[PDB]
Paper text:
Using a combination of biochemical and crystallographic methods we show that E. coli [name] and [name] interact to form a heterodimeric metalloprotease. [name]/E cleaves the N-terminal leader sequence from the modified MccB17 precursor peptide, to yield mature antibiotic, while it has no effect on the unmodified peptide. Peptide substrates are bound in a sequence-independent manner through β sheet interactions with [name] and are likely cleaved via a thermolysin-type mechanism.
We have checked the ability of EDTA, O-phenanthroline (OP), and several readily available metalloprotease inhibitors to block [name]/E action, using angiotensin II (Asp-Arg-Val-Tyr-Ile-His-Pro-Phe) as a test substrate. Subsite S1′ is more enclosed and deeper, being bounded by the side chains of His262, Trp256, Val259, Val463, and Val465. In the actinonin structure, the n-pentyl chain of the ligand projects into the pocket, this being a mimic of a Met side chain.
Numbering used by the authors:
A (entry chain B): 6 to 450
B (entry chain A): 2 to 481
Write the structure that this text describes.
């Protein structure tokens, strides 16, 4: 039945885009309009009882217009015809006061997804609040009952939403798509000898039937939380570092900002001179897969309506391309690569070792499992972040560690990766296993 | 303000006082401790200069209603991006489903009370011409570029928000606010012999854009900040590797008050303490910081970015002493957590918008000044770091571990500030770090009006402050 609510919403959104474009058309050289609507439920439990029930409904329309290469933008959450009219007028008025900028404008017609692919992103569920509560409660209760050292809770949580997005522009593109996301988590607190620790586990997917069970979530939550108890603060040292899979994804994630066209044309990236250079090991390829069916970050077009493409961003260690949008492409004398709004599923294969085998290879060193702070310079690659994780000796985890930092430079870190594990994290945009680096500076006692 | 806001949010949308009664009544059909209606309309603009031209401008509008039903620990919540009777009815009928049992229906009569004005009700978007606003950005560009030949790029942005809110609750609260907020941000890139670095400055508060053209220590504020961004960039360009490990750290006055925001601020929000999940839970009356430390959260500061004439529950902003001479005095609250803890609202019940739940949140968090001069503090260090500016920070309130990352820092060698060092993340335990504060300066200042605090995905304008202070032992995430 929810399919009908979504199809009604989609028709309304399509009409809102067409209305906005027509209102802009006689007064601008170009215009781009995006609208979205997201609806669903978010629930939490505390000690297995309902805590919060939140009903979500968010809508939005944005327009950008261009005249004499001058741009103006406006947005509204109200999608009434009169609100749309006011929004269009506001953008047009702004464009009288901004300066001509020839790199600005609607994306090139030759790059637009006029006939956008169906990526099967929409798997709705009629989950009632009571059903949502029971899933959250089950996850939380499974964590709480795992071990008597679990003495408090931050709850179970369940989220289920559907979305409709429509984009159009003055080249005649008008395409939209629907999507869903569902997730289930729990987060509990353990104590030992006057030390409290918190950790969490979760499952996420586009279809409810892709989720791990509540009991799986709770068991993982408890396992992770209990593993943090009674940490040591390491002494200041140099040692090898494994980025556990869950933070290894973020290690590769820093690449996005460093090869973004916006950073490149402004010369504000440490990789400015690295296009076609080997910045990673010669066996390492980062594959982008924007059209994976049901993919967590799949998209049929970027935020400027540009087609998304299968590309090897890194191929055998070599940086093959920048991540360009229409504006940054134009600054560089290039064409958009369909990266307005970010990256669309990165995949990095393992090199054959399990996490356990990686511990044995390293022998002695630090496993980082959680990082804190920004501490990454876009312009130099300098890296300094707070860390928690585990000390490893004799190829075995010895004790958890916290209240330490890890420091280095991304250029050196990336180039000298020893291996990547087969323990792939599969809940994220970037998916990879654990990553072994030969040395970082660890600050501590 | 209440009559003006009521005319704009209620009367203009076909609503009367008696509709408020009807909707609160619908909530009170259920067995609730509390219910509220939160109305909002807001207007945001931004303008950006880059490559010596006005590149971009935006105008963004939002409005809506949010409705909560609360019973003990429990909150039902629904909202709509429109202010209408139907939106209110739909939202109340969803929110009240948090409990099935009938209530007695006994609500308190709605009645507004006065609160102290903390900022103008004049709309900052309409109070200066567009070309005058753009002239602010043009002057920032010219000043930054003239400051040093190595300046190659300048991005300067101006943003302004005008927001009306009204809140009505089953406990009789009826209150409104009119909230202006403006911000100027400047980013510069410097280049020398193929080496590049960046610097930033800016600020603002709850007033019109004229503030950026007003005098700051004998110069035009915009000009002073343009020069500061360049200065920061050039320092960073010259910086060498930071040392690694535990050492004394002297923090500058102002924005380095991120220390307090992370080390104690979030940990003293009442939601975590009511649940027992904060390291500070049950520690009222204990020594949680050195005896030189008195930390306040102050929502009452005229014109400041982080202030709240009323919070989002209608509670007027307060000067709340959290830590007094090292002793924990209490927590920041919202109405839910105050009731559960047997305490009272403190003026810390804040929500990002009508589309989000309020929770306990900071306003302006700062440490009171002490007796030491900043020079005396620097002179006390044989080897360590002086960090007069930071980026951001983060805390885990359960394990009591926090970080914050330098944006300008120097070695101290033999009681003198010497070489600039590269950005480093500093890490410590909150309580243990506060207990290591051995000198507190006589030079309190707050940040320029730049802070955004995040909690549970909700961003808010928040201030920090402190004098210069010395932390005897803190772990510095350098490489050297
Ligand atoms: C009042 C907030 C104090 C700083 C802490 C916050 C994050 C936070 O809420 N931590 O608990 C932050 O880093 N905010 C940053 C921040 O506000 N900054 C970073 C540099 C200056 C200022 C500019 O907005 C960014 C990430 C938004
Ligand atoms: Zn914060």
């Amino acid at each position: 039945k929810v399919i009908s609510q979504v199809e009604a919403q989609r028709k309304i959104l399509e009409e809102a885009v067409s209305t906005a474009l027509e209102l802009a058309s006689g007064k601008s050289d170009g215009a781009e309009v995006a609208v979205s609507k997201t609806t669903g439920i978010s629930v939490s439990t505390r000690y297995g009882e309902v805590e919060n029930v939140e009903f979500n409904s968010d809508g939005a329309l944005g327009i950008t217009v261009y005249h004499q290469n001058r741009k103006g933008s406006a947005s509204s959450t109200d999608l009434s015809p009169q609100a749309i009219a006011r929004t269009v007028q506001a953008a047009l008025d702004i464009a009288r006061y901004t300066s001509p900028d020839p790199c600005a404008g609607v994306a090139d017609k030759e790059l637009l997804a006029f006939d956008a692919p169906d990526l099967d992103l929409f798997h709705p569920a009629e989950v009632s609040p009571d059903e949502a509560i029971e899933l959250a409660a089950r996850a939380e209760q499974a964590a709480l009952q795992a071990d008597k050292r679990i003495t408090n809770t931050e709850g179970g949580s369940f989220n289920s939403h559907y979305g409709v997005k429509v984009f159009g522009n003055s080249h005649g593109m008008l395409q939209g798509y629907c999507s869903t996301r569902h997730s289930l988590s729990s987060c509990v607190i353990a104590e030992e000898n006057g030390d409290m620790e918190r950790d969490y586990a979760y499952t996420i997917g586009r279809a409810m039937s892709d989720l791990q069970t509540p009991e799986w979530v709770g068991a993982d939550c408890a396992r992770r939380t209990l593993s943090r108890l009674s940490p040591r603060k390491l002494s200041t040292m140099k040692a090898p570092v494994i980025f556990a899979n869950e933070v290894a994804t973020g290690l590769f994630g820093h690449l996005v900002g460093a090869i973004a066209g916006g950073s490149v044309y402004r010369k504000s990236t440490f990789l400015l001179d690295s296009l076609g250079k080997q910045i990673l090991p010669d066996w390492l390829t980062i594959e982008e897969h924007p059209h994976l069916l049901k993919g967590l970050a799949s998209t049929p077009f970027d935020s400027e309506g540009v087609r998304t493409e299968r590309r090897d961003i890194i191929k055998d260690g070599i940086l093959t391309q920048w991540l360009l949008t229409s504006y940054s492409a134009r600054k560089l004398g290039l064409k958009s690569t369909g990266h307005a709004g970010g990256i669309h599923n990165w995949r990095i294969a393992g090199q054959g070792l399990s996490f356990e085998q990686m511990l044995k290879e390293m022998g002695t060193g630090l496993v980082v499992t959680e990082l804190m702070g920004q501490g990454v310079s876009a312009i130099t690659g300098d890296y300094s972040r707070g860390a928690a994780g585990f000390w490893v000796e004799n190829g075995e985890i010895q004790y958890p560690v916290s209240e330490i930092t890890i420091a280095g430079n991304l250029k050196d870190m990336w180039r000298n990766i020893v291996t990547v594990g087969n323990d792939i994290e599969t809940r994220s945009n970037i998916q990879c296993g654990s990553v072994l680096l030969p040395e970082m500076k660890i600050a501590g006692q | 303000s209440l009559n003006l806001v009521s005319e704009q949010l209620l009367a203009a949308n076909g609503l009367k006082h008696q509709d408020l009664f009807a909707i609160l009544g619908q909530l009170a059909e259920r067995r609730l401790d509390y219910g509220d209606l939160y109305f909002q309309s807001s207007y945001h603009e931004s303008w950006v200069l880059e490559d010596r031209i006005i590149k971009d401008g935006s105008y963004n509008i939002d409005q809506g209603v949010g409705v909560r039903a609360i019973s003990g620990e429990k909150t039902g919540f629904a909202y709509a991006d429109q202010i209408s009777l139907l939106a209110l009815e739909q939202s109340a009928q969803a929110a009240r489903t948090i409990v099935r049992d009938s209530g007695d229906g006994k609500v308190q009569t709605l009645g507004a009370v006065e609160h102290s004005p903390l900022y103008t009700s004049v709309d900052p978007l309409q109070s200066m011409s567009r070309e005058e606003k753009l002239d602010i950005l043009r002057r920032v560009d010219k000043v930054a570029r003239e400051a040093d030949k190595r300046v190659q790029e300048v991005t300067a942005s101006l943003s302004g928000v005008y927001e009306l809110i009204l809140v009505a609750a089953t406990d009789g609260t009826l209150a409104a606010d009119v909230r202006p907020l403006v911000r100027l941000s400047v980013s510069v890139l410097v280049e020398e012999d193929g080496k590049r670095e960046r610097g930033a400055s800016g600020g603002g508060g709850r007033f019109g854009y004229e503030f950026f053209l007003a005098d700051l220590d004998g110069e035009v504020r915009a000009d002073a900040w343009a020069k500061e961004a360049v200065r920061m960039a050039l320092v960073n360009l010259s910086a060498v590797a930071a040392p690694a490990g535990t050492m004394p750290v002297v923090l500058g006055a102002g924005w380095p008050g991120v220390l307090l925001h992370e080390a104690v601020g979030h940990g003293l929000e009442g939601d975590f303490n009511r649940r027992g999940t904060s390291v500070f839970s049950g520690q009222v009356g204990e020594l949680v910081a050195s005896e030189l430390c008195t930390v306040v959260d102050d929502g009452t500061m005229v014109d400041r970015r982080g202030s709240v004439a009323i919070d989002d529950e209608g509670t007027p902003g307060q000067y709340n002493v959290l830590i007094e001479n090292g002793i924990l005095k209490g927590y920041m609250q919202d109405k839910l957590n105050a009731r559960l803890m047997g305490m009272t609202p403190t003026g810390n019940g804040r929500r990002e918008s009508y589309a989000h739940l309020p929770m306990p949140r900071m306003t302006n968090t700062y440490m009171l000044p002490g007796k030491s001069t900043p020079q005396e503090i620097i002179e006390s260090v044989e080897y360590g770091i002086y960090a007069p500016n930071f980026g951001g920070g983060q805390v885990d309130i359960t394990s009591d571990k926090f970080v914050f990352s330098t944006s300008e820092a120097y070695l101290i060698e033999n009681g003198k500030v010497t070489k600039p060092v590269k950005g480093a993340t500093l890490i410590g335990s909150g309580i243990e770090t506060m207990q290591q504060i051995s000198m507190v300066g006589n030079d309190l200042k707050l940040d320029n009006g730049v802070g955004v605090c995040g909690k549970e995905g909700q961003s808010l304008p928040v201030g920090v402050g402190q004098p210069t202070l010395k932390v005897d032992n803190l772990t510095v995430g350098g490489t050297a």
